[PDB]
Amino acid sequence: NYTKFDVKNWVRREHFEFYRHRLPCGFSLTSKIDITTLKKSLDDSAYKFYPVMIYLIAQAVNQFDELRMAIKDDELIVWDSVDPQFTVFHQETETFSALSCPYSSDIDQFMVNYLSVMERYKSDTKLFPQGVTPENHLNISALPWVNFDSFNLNVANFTDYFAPIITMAKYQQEGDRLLLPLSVQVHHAVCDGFHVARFINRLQELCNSKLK
Amino acid sequence: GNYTKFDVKNWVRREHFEFYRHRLPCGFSLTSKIDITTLKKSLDDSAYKFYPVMIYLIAQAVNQFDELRMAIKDDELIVWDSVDPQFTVFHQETETFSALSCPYSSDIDQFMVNYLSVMERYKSDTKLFPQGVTPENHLNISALPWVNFDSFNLNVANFTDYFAPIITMAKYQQEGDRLLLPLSVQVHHAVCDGFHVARFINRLQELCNSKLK
Amino acid sequence: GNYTKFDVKNWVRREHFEFYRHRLPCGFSLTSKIDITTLKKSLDDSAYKFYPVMIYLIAQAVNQFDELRMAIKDDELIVWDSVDPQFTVFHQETETFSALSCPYSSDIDQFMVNYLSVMERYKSDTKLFPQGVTPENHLNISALPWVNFDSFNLNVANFTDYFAPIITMAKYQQEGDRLLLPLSVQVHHAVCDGFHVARFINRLQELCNSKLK
Ligand SMILES: CC(=O)OCCNC(=O)CCNC(=O)[C@H](O)C(C)(C)COP(=O)(O)OP(=O)(O)OC[C@H]1O[C@@H](n2cnc3c(N)ncnc32)[C@H](O)[C@@H]1OP(=O)(O)O
Ligand SMILES: CC(=O)OCCNC(=O)CCNC(=O)[C@H](O)C(C)(C)COP(=O)(O)OP(=O)(O)OC[C@H]1O[C@@H](n2cnc3c(N)ncnc32)[C@H](O)[C@@H]1OP(=O)(O)O
Ligand SMILES: O=C(N[C@H](CO)[C@H](O)c1ccc([N+](=O)[O-])cc1)C(Cl)Cl
Ligand SMILES: O=C(N[C@H](CO)[C@H](O)c1ccc([N+](=O)[O-])cc1)C(Cl)Cl
Ligand SMILES: O=C(N[C@H](CO)[C@H](O)c1ccc([N+](=O)[O-])cc1)C(Cl)Cl
Ligand SMILES: [Zn+2]
Ligand SMILES: [Zn+2]
Numbered sequence: 332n333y334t335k336f337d338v339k340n341w342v343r344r345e346h347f348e349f350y351r352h353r354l355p356c357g358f359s360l361t362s363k364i365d366i367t368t369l370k371k372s373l374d375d376s377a378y379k380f381y382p383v384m385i386y387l388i389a390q391a392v393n394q395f396d397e398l399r400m401a402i403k404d405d406e407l408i409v410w411d412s413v414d415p416q417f418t419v420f421h422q423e424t425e426t427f428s429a430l431s432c433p434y435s436s437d438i439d440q441f442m443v444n445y446l447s448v449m450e451r452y453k454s455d456t457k458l459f460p461q462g463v464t465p466e467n468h469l470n471i472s473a474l475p476w477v478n479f480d481s482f483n484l485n486v487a488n489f490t491d492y493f494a495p496i497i498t499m500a501k502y503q504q505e506g507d508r509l510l511l512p513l514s515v516q517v518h519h520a521v522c523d524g525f526h527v528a529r530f531i532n533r534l535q536e537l538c539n540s541k542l543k
Numbered sequence: 544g545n546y547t548k549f550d551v552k553n554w555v556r557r558e559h560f561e562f563y564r565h566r567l568p569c570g571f572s573l574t575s576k577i578d579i580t581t582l583k584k585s586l587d588d589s590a591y592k593f594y595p596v597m598i599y600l601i602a603q604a605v606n607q608f609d610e611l612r613m614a615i616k617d618d619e620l621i622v623w624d625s626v627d628p629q630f631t632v633f634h635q636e637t638e639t640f641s642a643l644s645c646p647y648s649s650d651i652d653q654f655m656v657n658y659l660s661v662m663e664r665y666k667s668d669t670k671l672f673p674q675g676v677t678p679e680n681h682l683n684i685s686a687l688p689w690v691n692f693d694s695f696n697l698n699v700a701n702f703t704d705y706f707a708p709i710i711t712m713a714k715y716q717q718e719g720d721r722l723l724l725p726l727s728v729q730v731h732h733a734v735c736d737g738f739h740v741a742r743f744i745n746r747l748q749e750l751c752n753s754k755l756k
Numbered sequence: 757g758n759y760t761k762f763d764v765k766n767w768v769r770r771e772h773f774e775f776y777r778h779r780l781p782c783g784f785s786l787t788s789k790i791d792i793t794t795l796k797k798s799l800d801d802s803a804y805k806f807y808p809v810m811i812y813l814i815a816q817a818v819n820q821f822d823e824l825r826m827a828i829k830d831d832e833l834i835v836w837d838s839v840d841p842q843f844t845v846f847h848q849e850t851e852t853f854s855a856l857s858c859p860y861s862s863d864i865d866q867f868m869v870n871y872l873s874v875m876e877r878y879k880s881d882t883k884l885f886p887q888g889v890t891p892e893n894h895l896n897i898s899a900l901p902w903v904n905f906d907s908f909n910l911n912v913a914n915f916t917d918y919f920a921p922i923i924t925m926a927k928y929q930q931e932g933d934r935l936l937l938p939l940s941v942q943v944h945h946a947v948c949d950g951f952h953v954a955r956f957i958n959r960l961q962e963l964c965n966s967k968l969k
Contacts, residue, residue, distance in 0.1 A: 346853075358909060483911070490913075528903035529902070
């Protein structure tokens with residue numbers, strides 16, 4: 332569930348109106364995450380790369396209100412917590428589906444939740460096997476077959492859609508660092524450059540930290 | 544060219560097609576670096592030039608995959624049997640470009656005959672479309688050889704039902720022991736997922752690493 | 757300021773202007789790295805700070821090229837004699853930004869006078885546009901100094917007839933013995949092709965590598 336944001340006392344109330352109504356826009360930015368440390372943490376564990384990245388991304392998002400915003404009854408709200416909606420691939424059809432699972436700050440509980448959803452739905456070729464996407468969501472996708480330096484979604488109508496869209500590519504070694512490309516796409520009504528940078532820098536810190 | 548009506552009812556992506564055509568219309572771009580170390584070395588011995596060879600290889604990779612030859616015709620999904628490249632050419636005298644097309648052939652020598660013929664007839668014409676209207680069965684290829692980029696994205700005001708891939712290359716540059724060509728690929732999500740764009744780029748990489756004859 | 761009414765009928769891009777304004781309305785972004793190794797050394801013997809110097813050099817390069825100073829005014833294409841930078845200013849206390857403008861000068865010292873004056877008058881003002889309406893003859897410049905990026909693109913719902921370039925710079929980063937500044941340039945294709953954007957980036961690179969004094 333959610334709270335109504337106090338727009339009238341917000342430092343960004345002018346910006347919110349401006350980028351929602353006067354100059355509606357968002358932006359994407361693609362950055363490399365250094366996963367050198369994370370790969371060492373992983374290689375010494377039983378967790379898999381994609382669910383760990385999902386967990387760390389969702390953890391970072393759940394720290395920052397402006398990454399959990401939405402419009403409900405034409406008012407700005409903030410979800411208390413958001414769950415990741417992530418894509419999965421079906422090699423037999425060469426199609427993908429979107430699944431979600433409950434976020435938990437505990438990585439072991441997260442992994443339980445994830446592996447359970449995968450067990451039930453990993454072969455289901457419906458686009459949305461679980462039915463309606465949780466309203467409190469953040470979108471995560473990977474393209475593990477190719478490296479990219481840039482990714483951008485051209486959406487014909489993004490009116491009042493404020494959930495961040497995160498896309499990863501195939502990681503690759505670049506000199507002395509193992510680098511994961513990560514695109515983050517937001518609506519400027521709720522996120523400026525500073526908030527996106529804060530998110531990325533926090534995710535980088537999480538990748539460089541003990542997993543638990 | 545010739546086309547066939549696609550069987551959407553029996554398509555594994557039937558649901559995705561409706562979703563990304565009607566519910567959430569969108570496409571995406573991505574920019575990837577192609578390793579052209581082997582190609583540049585191959586081209587050192589070739590009668591043919593870098594840009595027309597890249598056009599040929601891009602067109603060959605596109606022609607391999609049905610989802611990169613899709614269109615709406617008469618408000619139904621079709622697949623072109625084959626698509627022809629429409630490429631941009633620069634005019635040094637005016638600092639303007641034109642778009643030319645030529646018939647695709649899987650045989651590089653025949654392609655280059657076709658390419659040279661179009662260039663001979665039209666290369667000095669400063670009209671945007673010297674040949675008249677773009678053939679319906681087309682891909683778009685452009686080069687920006689004057690600057691290296693890591694990103695390129697087209698912001699198109701109305702891309703409704705436009706499914707032909709748009710390919711843009713930057714100035715190549717050396718990165719450690721490889722020569723890398725930045726290549727941007729922009730598609731519509733109704734017909735192409737990340738898998739299909741990745742498959743295209745990786746196939747193109749294979750073709751760049753292939754013998755020219 | 758002063759502007760001229762552009763002769764579209766005798767323009768070499770008459771047909772491109774029509775095409776990308778009306779037939780296929782679009783623009784593009786592209787992100788490139790600027791080598792600021794020389795500039796950074798230049799600034800180690802200067803009182804001038806990195807951000808205003810970059811504003812100056814970007815504005816200087818834009819002011820050299822007519823196609824980066826275009827607009828629609830009284831429903832016709834015009835060229836501004838000169839454009840002034842509108843730049844984003846960050847307020848650390850609130851973690852919000854404002855947009856400020858100051859007059860462009862070809863003299864770096866006068867430009868810095870102009871910049872420091874506006875900062876003194878308005879740096880504590882949290883309004884988005886403290887000075888009032890953006891000057892009609894403007895260029896937009898933003899910094900995003902907190903994170904390095906290789907791509908940046910603005911997804912603008914309606915960009916009809918907006919021809920002023922949008923320039924965005926990231927956190928600079930050391931790569932070997934080069935210090936690289938990511939720079940995104942986003943234009944309308946009606947007034948700028950790949951050639952002009954490349955020409956702008958390369959000119960900026962040349963200015964960064966030149967004496968400031
Ligand atoms: C947004 C947007 O897309 O706008 C741009 C619109 N498009 C245009 O303006 C058209 C641009 N096209 C061109 O300039 C030319 O068609 C192009 C790419 C230079 C090819 O010219 P061309 O037919 O004479 O054939 P090429 O031999 O391939 O090119 C001439 C030289 O440029 C070199 N070259 C071609 N493409 C590239 C590249 N991407 N990076 C670096 N060098 C290049 C090529 O290797 C050759 O070099 P050398 O002489 O050292 O061997
Ligand atoms: C436009 C757009 O967004 O389209 C994409 C649409 N989405 C899709 O098509 C779904 C793509 N997703 C997938 O393919 C799978 O979810 C994905 C990413 C491979 C994860 O699969 P998985 O859940 O079985 O779990 P993982 O162990 O993390 O991944 C499987 C393997 O790939 C490796 N891997 C996963 N992600 C990456 C990556 N980004 N780069 C390099 N290697 C990777 C991982 O190391 C493991 O290989 P090894 O066992 O040999 O070490
Ligand atoms: O469509 C989705 N994912 C795709 C996968 O390629 C993509 O990441 C995307 C995400 C969000 C989106 N949006 O909200 O506009 C559009 C595409 C989810 Cl809505 Cl299932
Ligand atoms: O306009 C074209 N090419 C430009 C050159 O900058 C660009 O590559 C482009 C391609 C396709 C396009 N579209 O289909 O939306 C828009 C721009 C061709 Cl359609 Cl002529
Ligand atoms: O909105 C502005 N700047 C933002 C900062 O994130 C961005 O650089 C931007 C610039 C121009 C623009 N436009 O003209 O469509 C949209 C966003 C200025 Cl108009 Cl104040
Ligand atoms: Zn309003
Ligand atoms: Zn018209």
